[model samples]
Each structure stands twice: as structure tokens, then as C-alpha cells.
Target: GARRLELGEALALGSGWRHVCHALLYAPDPGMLFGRIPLRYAILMQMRFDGRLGFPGGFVDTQDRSLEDGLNRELREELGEAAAAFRVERTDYRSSHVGSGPRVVAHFYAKRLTLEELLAVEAGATRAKDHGLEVLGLVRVPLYTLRDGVGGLPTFLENSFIGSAREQLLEALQDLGLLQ
Candidate 1:
């Protein structure tokens, strides 16, 4: 049962499994990291309470609310002001996965915001309801690799991730041209 899914097929099969939704929130910026390394984008990810990296979202009930709205609801609970300021819309949907072990579907979305807005989100997140519990802290994903292969996206990738979160991160990076 584990496989990549078409969005139409995934949505129609909602009755058989639970839907877990998450997003990759990133920003295009020309900012420099300490006036040296290029900070090409501000991609957001969270250090979860369980000490694993994952996006800011949770189980979404498509029965009562649409996937987009349900994800936004989860974001509001976890991201507070950031969720209120922006949204993850239907058109942003990327792909869904059906897992064999878990009777579920996983949906991923990516959204772009200004660096300023992402900072707002990072700051606002500390005050969210899920703060310090379900969410530990917000971190930026570095997009560069060092000369000796240290300290950047390569390093960040080594951190433990929950569920398919690690794969989702790679997928988002590859599709967005942040990775080859």
C-alpha cells in the first residue's frame, strides 16, 4: 500500500486512512551568512518535542475540513501569527504518499514567503500554543555545501527526522532547484 499517490486518487481514498499534512515554508533572499556563506533561501523546519525534525503541521481531518484548511488549522496551533499571516493553498500541493505500515496518507506542500515574514514566523512560533511541547524550536535549512563537506545542507540532513519527513525535505529541495 505504500506508494506515491496522485492527488486525485489520494483525496478520493480518504475514507480508508488518515491524512497527515505538512509544508515546506521557504523564502527567497540574498542574505549572507555572517558576510560569507550565501543564504539563498530561508527554509523553515521545526525541532519537534520528540527531538526529530519535521514540518509544522499535524493530522488533518478531511472529513469535516478540506486538506488545505485542516493543515492551516494545524499550522495556526503550532505557528500562531505566522499561520494567520499566510496560508498553504490547494495549488501549492506537491504530492502524497500512502504508507503500508500505517493506514494513512501523507501530503506535502511548499509555500514561499518574504524573509521578513519567515522571521516573523520564527519569532511568533515561540509563543504558540504548541510551543515548547509539541514544537521545540524553528530552524533555517542551509542551502549550501562547504568546501570540505561540512556545515550546511549536508550537515543539516544528518539530523534525525520523523516519519517520511526526511524524504519530504529532499523532495522539496530537489523540486525547488535548491538541490540536484
Candidate 2:
């Protein structure tokens, strides 16, 4: 009774469930640093007001919108005006996971932006209405593992992440070749 389907078909299966979408925004630049650690890429997630880490997106209404448009709408709300420069394209769709209310599907997207664009997002986010309410601030992932072990990605994984965000983060990294 199961079969393969594209995103549209997958969304067709989303009939009765609520829809949520989020993205992993990253930049490939060698100059960023985490403490004294050098970073070749900047991975941006957020410190949600709920004290959990998640990407910048939220519930997208299915009425009168393609999921891509809805996701862009949510991104504008969460990330502010700078969102214009890094809008999520439908082609960015990665995967979806069903969760919450025993009836919700969370779709994930990953997009690459210039370091300059990502930094603008971090700044504009503060001016966003949701800032300090739904979103606390932007956080950059520490890509370089600590020499003693467990201080980087391991420690990061120990923190709370909403829904399938952590899985999405890891999968996106793997898919983008940022993680080995």
C-alpha cells in the first residue's frame, strides 16, 4: 500500500494534518569563528523563546498558499526583512516528518546564502516582531569538534531542539557535505 511520491504527492497526503516548515540556513565562508575555533561555514539556527533550538519557520496555513510561499511568509515573520534576500525556493524542499497533535507534518528545507546575507538576517531578526517573543536570537553551530571530544557537535546535540529539527539539521549537513 506504500509507494514513492514527489513533494506534491507527499503534501497531498498531508490532508488532515497541520503543516509546519523550517529551514537550515548556512553560508560557506572561511572567515567566521566560534570562540578561537575557525569556521569554514556558518550554520544558523535560533534560540527560541521557548528555550529550545529550532530553525526560523513555523506553522504554514495550507489555504491559498503553496508550501513554499507559506514558508517564505513564516520566514519573513521570523527573520524579518532580510528574509527577502534568502527566500526559500520550492526546490529547497528536503524531507518531511509527521509529528504533534498526532496529526502534523513538518517539512524541512535547507538553503545556502552568502555570509553577508546570513549576517543581515541575524541583525534584521532583532527588528522582527517575533524577536524576543517567539525568537530569542541567532546561534551559529560550532563545526570544529573540541580537541578533548564532546565539546562541539556532541554537546550541541545534548541541548533541546524542537520537533525533528535536530534530525533535519544533521540530515541537511550530511546532504550538503558539511558533515562527514
Candidate 3:
């Protein structure tokens, strides 16, 4: 009976952690954050196209040791050295409706990394992960430009689905003195 109770508790803890689809973080700049918010061209999952924009990082595998570990691995695979200085700040989870059940879960987090660090990582990379994104027009939105260009163009933050992320950016910018 005691063993069954313990197993139940462990299961509860495991399920408490919602599966992730992506993590949204603020980079010191747009280009740097590209790895986190990679928008693939001609891909069905295109962020700017489908208008579902956010940072990089995704689901944990069944064999994954932990969510944190899985997140880091996805980061390295997608962003490479560009995320070396990235620091995580917060986390939030989302769930949607699927045909037969609740849809995929996405545990989004906030992180920050400097542009200099991202550039250094790129310089050392023998091969880039972006698959023809550069030639096809990869739209890397600069955080600064967004802060100032809010009234000038379409932004993901303006969408209803991402109100939380927008508010988070505003708070972050205010904290960083990038905005008042």
C-alpha cells in the first residue's frame, strides 16, 4: 500500500509538469533571439507566417532526464553557442484543445542573452542550423525596434493569444531601462 502511494505521488509530480512546445525568451537583440524564435520559411510551423511567434525550445522526450535538461539540449541544437549567456527568468504553461483531448502543452520561459555572445557563437560555428532561411527572407525582429516601433508595424505582441508575452516584454524592457 505504501509503495502504491509513493508511486502515485511520483506520477502526480511528473504530470504536474506540462509538456512543452516552446520557450519564449528575450534576447538582447532580434538576430540573437532568432535561435529561440526561429521562423522557418516555407515550413508549416512558420511563426511570422502563421503568426504564432515565440522563442525556441520545445517538448521533452519520454527518455529525457528532466525538463531543464531537455530545454538546454533543444537550445544547443537550435541556437548553438548563441545561447551561451542566456539566463532563464520565468516560466508559464499553456494548453489547447485537440480533436480527442487536450492539445499539446507548451511551457514557455523568459530568458536573456547578449548580442555579443550570440555573434561570437556564430563566428565559431562551422555550419549554421538555419535551413535556407537567410536566402528566403528570415525576419529577425529587433527587440529595440519593437520597443520603438510598436506603432509602426505588425507585432506578435499585438495578437490576443500572446498578451502575456507582450506584457512580459514590456516589464522586461522597463526593468532594463530600455523603456519607461
Candidate 4:
């Protein structure tokens, strides 16, 4: 049984155990050299404490100001002050999914940053408090190589990803016109 309330402008999926929000922080070709190969664009992914790959975000506090606010708060914790300037460019409702562990509802957000901003974010993340606790470190997923089908992506994918994070990442890449 479920209750439907016409709380206009308010969004929630039937009050659950956990509400999570994550972001795909991306930027134009930062010209990063990977073993002498240059990258044009990339998205940030995180290595969670559990030795799994995921995005930079955490559980949203139901008591927080709002879902978006909690999301920013989580980003601040995992990413540091760089996220403070992040603008959630868009969201994919289709990417939203339900979880099993605690029946959580996960929302994915995408933020587009300038190369300079993204670089700074990456630099600052190394010193963040959650660096070794909740987040091991940030890794860049090179978009150009994912579809190339000849590089390190296959091996990278083999490393465990949490739940639907991989699917959401793929969808976001397509939506952003980085993939075909």
C-alpha cells in the first residue's frame, strides 16, 4: 500500500529508507596525458571505500533542506570546495533507479565544468577528509576511449561498480553526445 500526495513542486518516491544523489562531473578536453596518449574530455568517477567504483556523492539526509541541498552537501564532503561552485546542468529521470540493500532511490545529476575548474576539483579532492574513508580517490573515465573498444576501458569495467552506476554512466555519456 502507498499514499499519493499532491505536494506540488516537491519530489520524493514514497518516503524510503535512503535517498542517494550522485553527479557525473565532466569537462571538455583537459588534454590529460595517459601514457603519452592525450585525452580530450573525461568524466570523474570515484573509488569507494568498499573497493568499488562509483560517482562522488552520498546518502541524502531526509531531514536536510532539500534533496538538491543534501546532494550538494554530499558532494562537498566527497569532492571538497570545488563542488560548491558546481551547477547541476541537468538530470536524467530515466537514470533514476531503486536499490536493494535498503530500498534506496538513487538520483543522478550531471555537472559541466570548465577544464580549469575540473582540474582544481581533482587537485583539491586528494586532500579532502573523506579521501581515504568514504572515497578512496577520483578516477577519470576517458569518454573518447570507451567507444573505441581498444583501450583500457574493458579492464576498467571489470572493476566492480556499485549497482546501476555503470548503466547511469553510459546513459549520461550518450545524453551528453560524447558517445554514439
lDDT of 2: 0.81
Per-candidate TM vs. native?
Answer: 0.93, 0.88, 0.48, 0.81
> What TM-score, to 2 decimals, does candidate 4 have?
0.81
Q: How are the candidates ranked when ordered by lDDT, highest leading?
A: 1, 2, 4, 3
lDDT of each: 0.87, 0.81, 0.41, 0.73
1-180 per-residue lDDT for model 2 (tens digits): 112235665578746767778988988877735456768788999999889999988887847378888898999998899998867887888887765356667788889899899899887888998988989898998776788898888899899988778888888778867676
- Give the C-alpha miss distance for residue 31 in model 1, angstroms: 0.9
Residue 130 of model 4: what lDDT?
94
Candidate number of the best lDDT: 1
lDDT per residue as tens, model 3, 10-84: 234455344543444433443333355322111101132234444455567777675566676665555556555
Provide the RMSD of all predictions against the true structure, rounded to 1 decimal: 1.7, 3.1, 10.2, 4.6
| Model 2: lowest-lDDT 10 consecutive positions | 1-10
Tell me the spans in candidate 4 whose CA falls farther than 4 Å from its real position: 1-12, 30-38, 89-94, 146-149
Which numbered prediction scores highest in TM-score against the true structure?
1
Which digits, one per residue and each the tens of the lDDT, describe model 4 over residues 1-180? 112122231254556557678888888874646546557577899999898899987887857776677778888888888777765533423345665456666777787789888888999998877988888999988544533675665567677998777877878877877555
Clashing pairs in model 1, backbone N/Cα/C closer than 3 A: none
Query: What TM-score does structure 2 among the candidates reach?
Result: 0.88
Residue 150, model 3: lDDT of 63
